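Researcher: Batch entry, complex prediction.
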Amino acid sequence: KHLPEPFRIRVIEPVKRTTRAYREEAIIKSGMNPFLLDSEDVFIDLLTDSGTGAVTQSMQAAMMRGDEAYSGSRSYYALAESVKNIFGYQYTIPTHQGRGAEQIYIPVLIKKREQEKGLDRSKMVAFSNYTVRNVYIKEAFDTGVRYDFKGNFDLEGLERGIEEVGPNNVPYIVATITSNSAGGQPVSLANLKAMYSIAKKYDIPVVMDSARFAENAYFIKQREAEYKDWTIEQITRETYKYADMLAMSAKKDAMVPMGGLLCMKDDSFFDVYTECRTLCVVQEGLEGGAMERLAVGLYDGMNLDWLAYRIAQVQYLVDGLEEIGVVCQQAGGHAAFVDAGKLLPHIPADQFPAQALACELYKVAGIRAVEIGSCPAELLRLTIPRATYTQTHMDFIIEAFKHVKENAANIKGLTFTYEPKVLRHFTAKLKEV
Amino acid sequence: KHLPEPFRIRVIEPVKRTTRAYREEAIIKSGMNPFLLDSEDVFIDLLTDSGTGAVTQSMQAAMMRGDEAYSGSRSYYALAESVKNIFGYQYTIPTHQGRGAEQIYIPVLIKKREQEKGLDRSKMVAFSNYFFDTTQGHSQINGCTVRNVYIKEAFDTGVRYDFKGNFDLEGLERGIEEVGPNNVPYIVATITSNSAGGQPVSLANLKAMYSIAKKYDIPVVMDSARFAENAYFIKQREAEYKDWTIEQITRETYKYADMLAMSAKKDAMVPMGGLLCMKDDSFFDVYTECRTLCVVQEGFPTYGGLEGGAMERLAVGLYDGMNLDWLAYRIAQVQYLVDGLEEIGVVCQQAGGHAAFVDAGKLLPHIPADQFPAQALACELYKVAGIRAVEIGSPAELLRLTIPRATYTQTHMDFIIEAFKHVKENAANIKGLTF
Amino acid sequence: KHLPEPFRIRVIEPVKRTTRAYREEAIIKSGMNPFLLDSEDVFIDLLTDSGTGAVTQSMQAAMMRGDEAYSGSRSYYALAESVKNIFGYQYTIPTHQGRGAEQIYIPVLIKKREQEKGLDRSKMVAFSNYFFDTTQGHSQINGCTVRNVYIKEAFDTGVRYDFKGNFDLEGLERGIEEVGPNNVPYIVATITSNSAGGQPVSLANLKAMYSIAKKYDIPVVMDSARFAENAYFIKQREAEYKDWTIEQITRETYKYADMLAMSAKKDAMVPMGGLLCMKDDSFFDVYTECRTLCVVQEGFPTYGGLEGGAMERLAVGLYDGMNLDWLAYRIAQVQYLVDGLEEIGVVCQQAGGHAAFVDAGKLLPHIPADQFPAQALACELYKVAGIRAVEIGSPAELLRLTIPRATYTQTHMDFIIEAFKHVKENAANIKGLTF
Amino acid sequence: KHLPEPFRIRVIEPVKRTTRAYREEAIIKSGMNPFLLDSEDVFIDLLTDSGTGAVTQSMQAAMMRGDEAYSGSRSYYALAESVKNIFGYQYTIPTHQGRGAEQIYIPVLIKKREQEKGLDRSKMVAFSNYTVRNVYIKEAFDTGVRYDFKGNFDLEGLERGIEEVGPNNVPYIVATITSNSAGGQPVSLANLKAMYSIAKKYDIPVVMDSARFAENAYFIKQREAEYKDWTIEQITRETYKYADMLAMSAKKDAMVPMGGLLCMKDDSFFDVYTECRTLCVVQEGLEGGAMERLAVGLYDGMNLDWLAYRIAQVQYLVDGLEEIGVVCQQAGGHAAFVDAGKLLPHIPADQFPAQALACELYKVAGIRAVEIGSCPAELLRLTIPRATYTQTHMDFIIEAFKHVKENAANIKGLTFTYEPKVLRHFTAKLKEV
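Model: Structure tokens for the complex:
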């Protein structure tokens, strides 16, 4: 069941209404790739939830108070300072997105090692619950074994892959939270701890990748026995003792439209922080009010009632769709991968099911989701933008997904009428087979 | 069936949780009276729909372009500018809210007649298909009393009549000679009408009344707080206009008054502001005098006590507030709540545009009007759910669920029906009160 | 010497240029009266300092955290919350602006005495070291007249006396028996005083008067629109307090009244809002009745017609408005304008906190009060410079340059002195008027 | 003379006041590199004017209307659409700063040529009024020959350097506006035209680099005979016919705190635009309200009265300082390079004059500017943040610069107490000699 929203709506952005008549000129002119579709034509946009969700009034006021100093920025203090209280790292380097924080730490952490341990470039390899090589447990992808912390570190797997390497050629460990395998599964503190030690020994750096830190917190609280009674920050603080440094995209749990963070725990890492400052000068990051905001989203992203709500309703949508037996090739907190061949068995791989599915939803409700499938299987993917849509929204979606599945029969398929050299799915244009 | 929100949500105000215990401490504290309950103790505050719901991005950006000149503010123009298009009136005085309009225009209109028609101070009576607290309080409190001329068919929770709050044209007709037209200083027309639980008025009905008014020639002040919900009802219900747009209907609608006085806190969806406007030169005279008064009361008529940004905003509210889809959603929802409530068997007045009314005593009947059956329901509701409702009373004193725009979802809706359920099945262990 | 602005500028409202020609069309149009000049025709609008100057980032962010509950809004608390700290009063009614406070509190205070002291309706008189338009208009317009008890030394543009707008303690003393203390319903204390051209009042002077008031025991309402500029003057001038902070002085200051009524449009630097407050339980009685009235006039005392965001903002205005540096700059500047004006030889009243006054007739003397020498200066100023000034008059009717906070720079300052120069040397080819 | 501001101030950010007492703990703890100084301690920050100036109320409202679509973003339309009306290019690709737009076009334009003309990588070279090689006229750096359009293209110089190369190894021409040599000098339309033709022939791409497009407009209007009577957009439109594509940092003339732009004129370049979309997917860019804003700053940046004002007062500051004979090693619209050895003759190169100068200003007024000098000469540099400070501000500065020049005698010098491996000036800490 869907929980009632633990807030009041104060500011809304209008969406017009669409006769299926109209919704077709549209998808036609889109040339059947909904990406290439005007929003403002999309009724319910499901294309992604990365900073496309709502904000709190404090977040808004925050944006009014930017001090746009280009140094010693009192705003920057605030941002880095809420980082110290929330995560207790003292080394905040605002980036402007997630992708930011990586483009900076990869090349440094590599070099730190290539030097004081003498790593070998062409035979180097990084590890991760989710080149990296992903060391996740066996339950991981077993939709239909209820394991509570599904994206944990395979401690042993990792152990092995380290010397299988061995220590001098692993620059770091990323520990994504929540883990990003299988539409987003939690990682336990006990596991987090565990894994961290497996690094202390071979002395490797541990980079906590936390776009969904708040959610992961909640799962630990909902589920790890011995925490059931810690608050979200309490959890989160403790959590962060098991990494040296954190790299996040604020556009998720932090609740802001723009923003990235790359930060460091203590001066045992000031050494590194020093070199990212050096690197960051040539590239990447942010408006002063941006910082004031993110400084707040950080605390706002963690309110319990909210996360409970947020996760509630992602859940609710999925329960909603199994109830009408729509196949999901995985379901979690990040996304929802409906399976399209199953929902649409009589349309081949080179006729494209996902696009086709995508367009129908579109015609029928005006939902915009996304062929993520091409070759393993053909998936069409859902995500939900925080504090943006309702249960009625969810209902409309679900229901729309019925009508699809009933006309599953005379819904057609697609064959290229233009396709660019790389990344076909972003601007290709299709027709049926 | 709840309609899905015709909009994405953009900015929310998060709200604290609660302990049943605490809540009790709270209501006990409130004078046993949810009304004086504090904002952060309530979880769904249905106290009133007046300036409490959401605004549009455009609305809010608008609030950053205030021109704050004390006199002849660009913003004042922008607002008059839109009053002309939306309603077609040419004389636009901004007041800070409806009470403003009203403390200004009654006494103005009361002197118009005391002279050119020699009206009798102590024998005077003003008419309306209803009057708000403010309207009659400010008319009782000025010397002149009102009498309502609603239809027989009015609050009858049995028959479902499409325009449930029209003017009784005849009961009005009568009332006019019955008091000597020299002495009706003005007729107020409320749209939608407040005390029907929010019931429509017909264009046709409007026409007809306007005729009687041009007849003894009496000012007609459209009271306009929910002008948009009214217009919608027409579009869905009055035969001729099924095909027009909302402004379109609005516009027609607004031919039948020499002036409008209005609270922008409801339909126009500003947190603050009201309008006092006149239609054409046949009234510039009045405008002139109103303008005079306004200084003294709200301040200079370039602001009538609005800041620049507020004018800017209302100037866009007035638009946004008419958007079709939106009111279809807004109304739907009030509606979906009422249906939700019939099915658990709670007798409530017809779906108006904005609130929902509840037969107090029936849901709990073994309570007599000595101990009050309206209030304890409030208290209870809150006690149990963290809902705040209140009882402004209307035969039978009863319970009102006014409903802030764009603020709560189907789910909040469902959570309220719910509490009425929990409440039903404890009517047995449930008491009465004297505050 | 202009002090440099103690702040970076963050958000500006760009302003249209002008053709001398057009400007003339414009003033001719205005009724020959700059006042009704339109906002975008003016280039430096000195019409009044009331809600027209700048706000702080904090102020403005604040406006995004409104809680908009009709009753018991978190924001209402935040605001009362800061009234307590800043002034130490415990009874905080928000009105939408000073007129509000005043339409509420006069009549309230007028019944206090009509009963417990049996005051005589028709024989009643209220006292003050001055009264604004609104204050006396709302007291003339309520039955009770005022008399001002300013000092001999008051408007004398010759002597420079540090606290130029004190109470004549004795001229007051006298006036009280002279009218029978049963009949003074209240004394209003203005700080700074408006009609001195903005002149300070002394803490000492305040004390002394408060004594006389506790004596015949009469309510003292501090009228508080420029309470901060007042406090500063003291800090720079009253001997004992040279060392304290502004709140510090404020606080002391505010012991000597049983209540304050206030317009936040000036010193507290909100675009909109006013306060009506009482100090301690010795008055909760009053508060109680004021609260009653407010409904009828501004609306429910959790907002007194303010939106949530406005409460939030003023709640931070009240602070920001006392910042030292700021008022040092604010005042400096008014000052630097006056000096600028003496040196081209224009006789103007002492530097008050906020405006600048001008001997009308002197700068142009071969104009007699038949043709008006105040107005044509206005017109001219504007005609020539795109300045708008106005003449609210004060012996001799004269010209006022009130000056919006944080809005115009030294340069704008210089550009105004300038026009007075251009204007001087054309007094020869310059005329008089009858509108 | 300083012109009065053609606006009203509405929103101010507070700055506290500082006893020189206090201003010293400060610069000390800064370790004598003012960069490392808390703003909020700086009275008048002169560190830079890149998006650290003010905005219009329309700019502010604009930021309230972001539609934060992750595609077909109605906001994006607005931004790209004001770009079409202002510059008439149809290919807007918002970046998130100036530096953005380059990191994208360099590598593409190189490749466009390396292929359809067959450029040679190690012997390739780009040209510019200001590797590139700068082809500016002889007057350029002659402080004290009043030439009105000082940063123009040396047509002949360029001519030569092209074949001296020849055409196949010049990927493009950048044409910075205003040109960035010698603290910012204009470029004439006639010159712009001229130069463009010198590319049409060898068919080279012309990339208009326009962080200060509005100012440059004004100079042309103030100065090119035959335009004296065109408006700023009129000028600007015409201007842009002489490039194929434009790369700007909105943080200057566009008047926003965040933002970049990379855009293209017509489909003769759609070809290229296509590949930058490809490249841009892996990296770089912006909040929806950001776009709404910049869409407005674009028009706002151009109001005449304003630019006149803005340039006025930059001028005024300089006239102000020659009047007290402070030596500027160059003066223009971008910055102001005071000469420090001249102002401070009795302090050597390895004792550092600029830092020393920087600190004194600081102690005396609380001005923060910047040693740009190390070896040619030792400069300390000023810039002014738009619509932020006043004339009184300027006066305070100027005057402060007197007191400096009178105690020119017992003002000391500096010698390293820590210096990092690269970019010493950003975090080094100094002491006197």
